[PDB]
Amino acid sequence: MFRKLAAECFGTFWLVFGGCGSAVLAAGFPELGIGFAGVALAFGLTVLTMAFAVGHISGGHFNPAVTIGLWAGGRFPAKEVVGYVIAQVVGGIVAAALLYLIASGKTGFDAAASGFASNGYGEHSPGGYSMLSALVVELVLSAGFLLVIHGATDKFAPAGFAPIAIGLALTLIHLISIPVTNTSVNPARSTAVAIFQGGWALEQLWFFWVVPIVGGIIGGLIYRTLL
Amino acid sequence: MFRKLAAECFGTFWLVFGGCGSAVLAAGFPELGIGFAGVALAFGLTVLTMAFAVGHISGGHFNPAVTIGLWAGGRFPAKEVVGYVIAQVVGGIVAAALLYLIASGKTGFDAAASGFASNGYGEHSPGGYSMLSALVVELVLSAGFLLVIHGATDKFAPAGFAPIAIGLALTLIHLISIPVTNTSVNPARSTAVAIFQGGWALEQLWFFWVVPIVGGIIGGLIYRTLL
Amino acid sequence: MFRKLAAECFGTFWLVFGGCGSAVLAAGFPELGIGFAGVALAFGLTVLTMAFAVGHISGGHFNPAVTIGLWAGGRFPAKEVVGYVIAQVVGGIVAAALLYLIASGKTGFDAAASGFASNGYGEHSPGGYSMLSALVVELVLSAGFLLVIHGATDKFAPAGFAPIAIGLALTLIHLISIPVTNTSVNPARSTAVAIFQGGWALEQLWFFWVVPIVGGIIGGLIYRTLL
Amino acid sequence: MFRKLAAECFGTFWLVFGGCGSAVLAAGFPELGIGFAGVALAFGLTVLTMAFAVGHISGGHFNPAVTIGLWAGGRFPAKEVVGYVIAQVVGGIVAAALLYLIASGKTGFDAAASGFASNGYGEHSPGGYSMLSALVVELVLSAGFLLVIHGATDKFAPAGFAPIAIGLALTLIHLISIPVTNTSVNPARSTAVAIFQGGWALEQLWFFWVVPIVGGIIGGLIYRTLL
Ligand SMILES: CCOP(=O)(O)O[C@@H]1[C@@H](O)[C@H](O)C(COP(=O)(O)OCC2O[C@@H](O)[C@H](OP(=O)(O)OCC)[C@@H](O)[C@@H]2O)O[C@H]1O
Structure with a gap:
């Protein structure tokens, strides 16, 4: 079990560090910054690389909504959740x-103001998108993310490529919803940085818990059911 | 059959949402937009990801030109097209x-004004290209795309890699023809956003439903015949 | 040996069409251009995609210096060269x-003037480098390209990955040279576009035959001798 | 064992020439420059490609810290270090x-004035980061890198995908740290360009030997101990 938990901790630690790291340290760097599309890649890579390294230990979750999503999909044990x-x-x-x-x-x-790569919606959204838009986009992308995970993990899927699927899948997701909520789909990655914002990020922090979880559950049921 | 249909449905949904969604949300974002290459990556990724996820169910087409392209080349059952x-x-x-x-x-x-990421040509071509240009590009890429699909799915090609190839093929295609037609090579994709543009997008919609399927068939036959 | 030549033909086409295509059409588009890196990806992505498609037919060369090289390496019959x-x-x-x-x-x-994505050195070096520099870099990246080809295809290399290894390899090489010679390392590609330039493109072209092919040999022998 | 040494030698050469190449030749370049993100991909690719190529000959380290790190992970003989x-x-x-x-x-x-892609901190940090901050990223991303390298190569990990995991992992590392230390995490890389700076680059060179090797060893101990 420890191995499993350590796997899941370094995994996520890696996700956040690389993810919000590129987000914070290189995204808008003066002239050679990596922009949104860089951060998009980064994040995915944290999952593509961590999935290979330790995925074979836990399950390569690194995401609460993926741990809960895989559960509703009948793939994960409700005990270890x-x-x-x-x-x-x-x-x-x-x-x-x-x-x-x-x-x-x-x-x-300055963690505050800068937002410390925190997720938000409306007035606190990168593009200034309505909370509703932030709800719709987060949901679909969360659902779709588990929908892809269950698929790439399905015993009939090209074995060993799963990490690439799931990995790049997260890059896709980012390329898509950064301007909206700065991309979450991971209540763990959203909490971590909110803590250090300690303002609006913490007020809206809940949003990025319920929404991703719900959507991941849909994605899970959608695969368990219709496949 | 239902799975095969649900798989193809969710798959395309993922494609329009990820590809068109990134183009309509992040491609042109202020200082950090993903630009064309951004969109190009994303698009190819929707495919690469669903190609793995549900590829093992419906064959992972997500594109009407791909399905008909396979039928033509002789790999998909006309009775399912x-x-x-x-x-x-x-x-x-x-x-x-x-x-x-x-x-x-x-x-x-504004959907109409902005273009909601619809496909067009001349006066509607992002780079303002002739229709002759829009025709040649879409045609060649469509063909090549289908050939790449056939070759990557040949019983003699590296097993399981297909999704990586076909998805990156679509990214390659978007890197080459977004300035021209905004890159279609997919009737269902072109249709979706066009509908929301209402205007000219539907006015040229036919173009990206004839040219694309024609090229897909030429490409399919190119391989079925010559290899 | 028709099937082989057919593949070797369509591939090269996809290479010159997707690479130079992306260069001329996208690359420096108004404000969403794929830029030098975009091209670089594109170029590689062509080889990555065709290797999977028809590699299992012709050996996926798509490059004179990659055939002459494989020959010097002792992987390709001098006959079919x-x-x-x-x-x-x-x-x-x-x-x-x-x-x-x-x-x-x-x-x-305008094919001439713009350069039509042809390769050149000094006065015709994207960044205006010397021929010496052009020479050294074309030489190192040719040899390196082959050494990576030979290696990724050694009976003891991860089977089925070669296309990825060689493809991204080309991308890497383009990420490096571009500013120097627009990255050749392929006598075939350099010619194709030089023809349509019809100016200096052809005048310096000789250079883009001897240098890459020599390098490709260096690499062949390198791996063939020391590994 | 000369093959292994030849393998590690060309590998590393491909690493410095490839990454520092893109860095001092393309990252900047006018309106098309590959910037940090390009430079990031580059470096990663040099590893990925050479890993598939000669990785089956030496284990594909191309990094002193990665060799010493493996040693600590109980994966490499001290005799050969x-x-x-x-x-x-x-x-x-x-x-x-x-x-x-x-x-x-x-x-x-001016290699000197330009820095020539050398790693440094404080006054010589691209973003002007302090040495403490330098210390921390370098340390983390080194133990992380070495950690990913162990898991990807674990007997229970997906066979053959290592080179993709590792190489892509390095691209990630670069996406997160370039602003800070310009990303060393490899003592051999730092040394190489420093020599041609011959001022401050050498002055801080020591830091990029101890820090990344300490990180690399910790990384391995982590995997050795907690797997
Ligand atoms: C099962 C869980 O495993 P973990 O996820 O915890 O991950 C490992 C660490 O265990 C290992 O020590 C290092 C080097 O890093 P170092 O651990 O930080 O320790 C050495 C060290 O001493 C502290 O007091 C300083 O404290 P603060 O974080 O409180 O400062 C906050 C502003 C810290 O910055 C400095 O690096 O690399 C990490 O990834």
């Missing part, structure tokens, strides 16, 4: 913790 | 629907 | 032709 | 040497 979620959330915090430290080594940093 | 094509068009439209709703959360959005 | 190359150069020119036609569709185009 | 490092460092220097020659071809170039 909670642990997995804590582990993911803990790893994420430890990540944003260092990230924050690292980000401070530069003049002008 | 129309079933897939419906599922796909329906899927794509559901996507365009949600995308439409989502894009409206940001003040100042 | 001249045949491949012919096909490779042919298919390329047919692509550059169609591209030319497509490129002329936009008001303002 | 010192040999590998010499190979890698020599291969790197040779790359910087030519790359130096190539960049010098363009009018107006």
Whole structure:
């Protein structure tokens, strides 16, 4: 079990660190920044790379909504669920913790305002998208993400390619909804950075818990049911 | 059969949502938009990801030109073609629907004006290209795309890699022809967003439903015949 | 050996069409251009996609220096050499032709002047490098290209991945040279477009035959001797 | 064992020449420059391609920290450690040497003033990050990298996908840190270009030997201990 939890912690820690890291440290860098499309890749890679390395230990979740989604899909044990979620959330915090430290080594940093790569909606959305839009897009993408995970993990799917699917799947998702909610689909990755924003990010933090979980559950049931 | 239909439906939905969705949400974002290459990647990824996820169910077409292209080349049962094509068009439209709703959360959005990521040519070509150009490009790419599909699915090609190839083929295609026609090579995709543009998008819609399927068949036959 | 040459022809076409195509049409589009890196991806993506498609038919060369190289390496029969190359150069020119036609569709185009994605050195070096620099870099990336081809195809290399390895390999090479010579490392491609330039493109072309093919040999022997 | 050393040597050469190449030759370049994101992909690719190519000959380290890290993970014999490092460092220097020659071809170039893609911190950090911040990323991303390298190569991990995991993992590392330290995480890479800076680059060179090797060893101990 430990292995499983450690796998899930470093996994997520890696997700956040690389994800919000590129987000914070390189995304809008003066002239050579990696923009949204860079951050999009980054995130996916944290999952593509971590899935290979430790996926074979836990399940390569690194996401609460993926742990809960795989559950509603009949793939994951309801017993081990909670642990997995804590582990993911803990790893994420430890990540944003260092990230924050690292980000401070530069003049002008500020977790608040900058948002510390926190997710939000309306007035707190990158594009200024309505909460509703943030709801619709998060849902579809969360559902679709589990829909792809269950598919790439289905015993009839090209074995060993799963990580690539799931990985790049997250890159896709980002390329899509950054302007809306700065992309979440992961209540662990959203909590981690909110903690260090400690403002609106924490107020809307709930949103990025219910919404992703619900959608992942739909994605799971959609696969368990219609396949 | 239903699975095969649901698979193709969700698959296309993913395609229109991810591809068109990124183009209508992030491609032109201020200082961090993903640009064309951004969109190109995303598009190919919807395919690469669903190609793995549900590829092992419906064969992973998601494109009416791909299905008919396979039939032509002699790999898909003519007795199933129309079933897939419906599922796909329906899927794509559901996507365009949600995308439409989502894009409206940001003040100042206008489907018709903006183009809702529809395909066109001349006066409607992103780079303002002739129709002759739109015709040649879409044709060649469509063919090549189908040939790549046939060759990648040949019993002698590396097993399981297909999805990586076919998806990256579509990214390659979008990197080459977004300035021209905004890259279609998919009737169901073109239809979905066009409907929400109402105007000229539907006015040239036929173009991206004849040219694309023609090329797909030429490509299919190219391989079935010569290899 | 028809099937082989057919493949070797369509492939090269897809290469010159997708690479130079992306260069001339997208690359520097008003404000969403795929840029140098976009091209770089595209170029590689052509080889990655065709290797999977017809690689299982002709060995997926699509490059004179990759055939001469495989020969020097001792993987390709000297017999089938001249045949491949012919096909490779042919298919390329047919692509550059169609591209030319497509490129002329936009008001303002001009094959000469713009350069039509041809390769050159100094006065014709994208960044205006010396011929010496042009030489050294074309030499290192040719040899390296082959060493990676030979290796990724050694009976002891991860089977089925070669296409990815060689494809992304080309991308890497384009990410590096571009500013120097627009990245050749393929006598076939350099020719195709040089023809339609009809100016210096042809004048310096000789350079883009001897240098890549010499390098391709260096690499062949390199891996064939020391591994 | 000469093959293994030749393998590690060309590998690393391909690494420095490829990454530092794209870096000092393309990242900047006018309106098309590949910037950090391009440079990031590049480096990753050099590893990915060479990993498939000669990875089956030496284990594909191309990084002193990655060789010493593996050693700590109980995956590499200490006897061969010192040999590998010499190979890698020599291969790197040779790359910087030519790359130096190539960049010098363009009018107006000063390896010194330009930095020549050297790693540094504080006054020499691209984004002006403090040494503490430098220390932290470098450390984390090194232990992380080495960790991913272990899991991807675990007997229970997906066979053959390692080179994709690792190489892509390095691209990630670069997406997150370039602003900070310009991303070393490889003592052989740092050394190579420093030599041709010959000012501050060498001045801080030590830091990029101890930090990434400490990180790399911790990484492995983590996998050795917690798997
Ligand atoms: C099962 C869970 O496994 P983990 O997810 O926890 O991950 C491992 C760490 O265990 C290993 O020590 C390192 C090097 O990193 P170092 O761990 O931070 O420790 C050495 C060290 O001493 C602290 O007191 C400083 O504290 P703060 O985070 O409180 O500062 C906040 C502003 C810290 O910055 C410094 O790096 O790399 C991590 O990824």
